[PDB]
Design a protein around this nucleic acid. Structure first.
Lengths: 178, 64, 120, 119
RNA sequence: GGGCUACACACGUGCUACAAUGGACAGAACAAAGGGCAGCGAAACCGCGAGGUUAAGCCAAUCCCACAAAUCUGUUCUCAGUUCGGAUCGCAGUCUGCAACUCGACUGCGUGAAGCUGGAAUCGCUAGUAAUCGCGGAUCAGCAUGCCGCGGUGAAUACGUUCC
RNA sequence: GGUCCGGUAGUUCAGUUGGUUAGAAUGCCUGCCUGUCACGCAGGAGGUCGCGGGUUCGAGUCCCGUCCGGACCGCCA
RNA sequence: GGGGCGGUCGCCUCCUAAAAGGUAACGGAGGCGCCCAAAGGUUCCCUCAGAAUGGUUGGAAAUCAUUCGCAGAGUGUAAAG
RNA sequence: UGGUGGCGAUAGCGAAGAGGUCACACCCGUUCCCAUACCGAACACGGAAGUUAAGCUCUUCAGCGCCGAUGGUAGUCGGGGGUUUCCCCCUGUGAGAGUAGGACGCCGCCAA
């Protein structure tokens, strides 16, 4: 909750002076994060896609749900049924308890990483990010999982423009390659 | 919040080799962490860390 | 960036589908329900004339819950709606759940009316 | 994972355990351990709660995994844009140091196959 | 100045390995023969190393090249693309030479291919031979996995002329 | 002219019905065998399924059209 | 539109059929001798295809976020409605 | 001003201005009822700190969508005549399309 108090006292007042706001009260707000698994099956016979689903319980406490395909693909499995990947939509106090782990711990842990996200902005608001290691998340043990599985994060901004959406992220302490 | 599906979250105690600590929440009562933003060279201003990038390039080779 | 539909217009679509399920009018009055965030209004209207045969609300100079706008206090107002209907001899009114789920506390308003002698 | 060179293994003595680091080799490990005074110690991984940190600092002075990969990468990219001839050997499949081609030198050439006959 | 060193590939012939009879570290121990004055160059000192600084002695059964290596004795790794092997390449040095890009050698550091004994087929050798470990020389400014020698360790089998 | 059957490695034939996948012989290429060839031994490549569409998740396969190669009819005054 | 040969014989959709319906030809385009205990019943909820932008192993597409989408979707199977 | 109706986007999109003490809302909580192929987003419940920014209503706009004549022609009815794979005139019908114009709403009930 320390991150949650942080924008209630530090970020917002500074954000208010950076440019004018209609009706004073208006301020961009984080909405939902969506973590993707993908897995890739390779090919369909994981055999246990659910074993990957258990792994995501560590990255976030919200229960993952498998994303069943709504369309068949000629190049890869499969027609509808036998779900591929999983999805999570953490909210509330969980939102900043998770984001606090992201800046302070997750991103710096990565080897080659120093900073990203420049062209990444939609020009509308939403942020996107890729995650390629479970070593990135401290709660996971090294002994578990063995083979690497992919991950994603999508922060949402209330702001109608990326110029406002970006400035909100900078005060959060989010890294940028610059 | 479904009962018995979501693991319990006791107040976490994040720690680090530099002695930095962070108060959050996790399934584990205590969480040692190898790296923190207060220790990582990028987040900590522009520390030389190990570079000293561009030393030397594209030329500086002379010996008399 | 998100712009979800307001918690109102989506209800009207959920309300309109209910309208097909029952004609309501047949010289027999219907009872619509509207749950505003503060409190629930209640009204009674019948086709073709569209005249409001009876109406009542939690927000009135008469009667004090006094807490108002929650729990069993609404049942006193829901019972009050039937008491107005009782003067007309009304009736056996169909209930209009609207887009809101039938469980409560809007359900509690329906429960008191049955105790008040309305036939449904 | 891990505290110094990323992804050092387990159930192995510390010297070979950090020779695996993309940077330090054998003799360099002998030097950093000579600074350490560990004496080997420890066959598995159990060093000391703070000594692991002070060693983490000395290893931190050495540099550095994927950025060291960026050193060689930026170096050969410097060796191709310069003209060139050395990077030319780097991408012909030609050995660079200078050791013919009429036989062997398959380290870059690969195995298969063959496309000639006479007569 | 190039090229004789080409490069998609084939073949001949060597070298190094694919490892626990082993790898790595430490200690200890046994040679022969050959070369050396436009040379060998000790010892002392500097550099992690290569070498450098300086310089005794030796026309040599005197002195120098020069330390033998396998081995033995212990410590350590405990069966894997590995503390197996070293390829390839990067960076930084070094010897020779007016001069090391083509196209030299060596060293330090870093990078750690392939290969876990190899199809069809084929070669050598009857004892100090095969097996294997080091050393020297001719060549030579520099460049020897080739060649010519030196010694260390050191077997298995030969029923026999059916067959090639 | 009218129906029916086929078109797939260089060549000659399987795989088609059973819808998610292409094999065999020979030939070709490589290394051996012999002082020379063949033969023999040990390895290797090579077909996009005649073409043009449709159906379907996906077509050598199913459904059509078309271009070819064959096999039957083309009769009675 | 002589017979023989070929093809066809029943049911369902559209057009030809001419703004009720009907309506012929060896007229023009297609399907069916099924399928499903659920894809049925009821109740409570939800809205598509495709496009643009951002993104790990994701490439023209498996997954996810967003503006756009009066239906360019889906409606077991084929057409109309 | 809120709720709930009837009239065929003449009720709409879009653009520019306005509002809130009450009312309507966003908003604040998840201990309870209920909850979520998971989720207090939604769905349910109980709270008034913050404001109209959005939603909600008012005031403007013909850029788009919509409504839409009058008048003409196409077609055609009952007829007739030729140069008849069709064409021409008489009688009664009358489109489309475009334009003039209309329009960014009215009529009700209930509550304050």
């Amino acid at each position: 909750n320390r991150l949650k108090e942080k924008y209630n006292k530090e970020i917002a007042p500074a954000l208010m002076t950076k440019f004018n706001y209609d009706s004073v009260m208006q301020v961009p707000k984080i909405e939902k994060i969506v973590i993707n698994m993908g897995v890739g099956d390779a090919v369909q016979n994981a055999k246990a896609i659910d074993s990957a689903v258990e792994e995501l319980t560590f990255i976030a406490g919200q229960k993952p749900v498998v994303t069943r395909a709504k369309k068949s693909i000629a190049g890869f499995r499969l027609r509808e049924g036998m779900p591929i990947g999983a999805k999570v939509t953490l909210r509330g106090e969980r939102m900043y308890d998770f984001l606090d782990k992201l800046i302070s711990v997750s991103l710096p842990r990565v080897r080659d990483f120093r900073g990203v996200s420049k062209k990444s902005f939609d020009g509308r608001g939403n942020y996107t990010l890729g995650i390629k290691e479970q070593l990135i998340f401290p709660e996971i043990d090294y002994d578990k999982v063995t083979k690497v599985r992919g991950m994603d994060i999508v922060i949402v901004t209330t702001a109608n423009t990326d110029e406002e959406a970006r400035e909100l992220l900078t005060q959060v302490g989010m890294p940028f390659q610059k | 919040m479904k009962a018995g599906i979501h693991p319990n979250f006791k107040k976490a105690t994040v720690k680090c080799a530099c002695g930095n600590e962070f108060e959050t929440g996790s399934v584990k009562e205590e969480v040692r962490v190898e790296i923190c933003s207060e220790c990582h060279p990028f987040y900590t201003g522009r520390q030389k860390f190990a570079s000293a990038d561009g030393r030397v390039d594209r030329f500086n080779k002379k010996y008399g | 960036m998100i712009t979800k539909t307001s918690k109102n217009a989506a209800r009207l679509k959920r309300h309109a589908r209910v309208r097909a399920k029952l004609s309501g009018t047949a010289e027999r009055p219907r009872l619509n329900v509207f749950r505003s965030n503060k409190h629930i209004y209640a009204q009674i209207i019948d086709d073709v004339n569209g005249v409001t045969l009876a109406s009542a609300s939690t927000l009135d100079k008469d009667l004090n819950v006094e807490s108002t706008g929650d729990t069993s206090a609404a049942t006193k107002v829901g019972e009050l709606v039937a008491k107005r209907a009782a003067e007309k001899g009304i009736s056996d009114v169909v209930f209009d759940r609207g887009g809101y789920l039938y469980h409560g506390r809007v359900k509690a308003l329906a429960d008191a009316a049955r105790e008040a002698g309305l036939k449904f | 994972a891990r505290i110094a060179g990323v992804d050092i293994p387990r159930d192995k003595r510390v010297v070979i355990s950090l020779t695996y680091i993309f940077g330090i080799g054998r003799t360099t490990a002998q030097q950093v351990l000579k600074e350490a005074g560990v004496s080997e110690d420890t066959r598995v991984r159990d060093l000391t709660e703070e000594e692991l940190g002070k060693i983490r600092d000395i290893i931190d002075k050495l540099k550095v995994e994927g950025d060291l990969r960026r050193e060689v990468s930026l170096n050969i990219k410097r060796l191709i844009e310069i003209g060139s001839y050395r990077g030319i050997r780097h991408r012909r499949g030609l050995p660079v140091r200078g050791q013919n081609s009429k036989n062997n030198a398959r380290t870059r050439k690969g195995p298969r196959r063959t496309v000639a006959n006479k007569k």
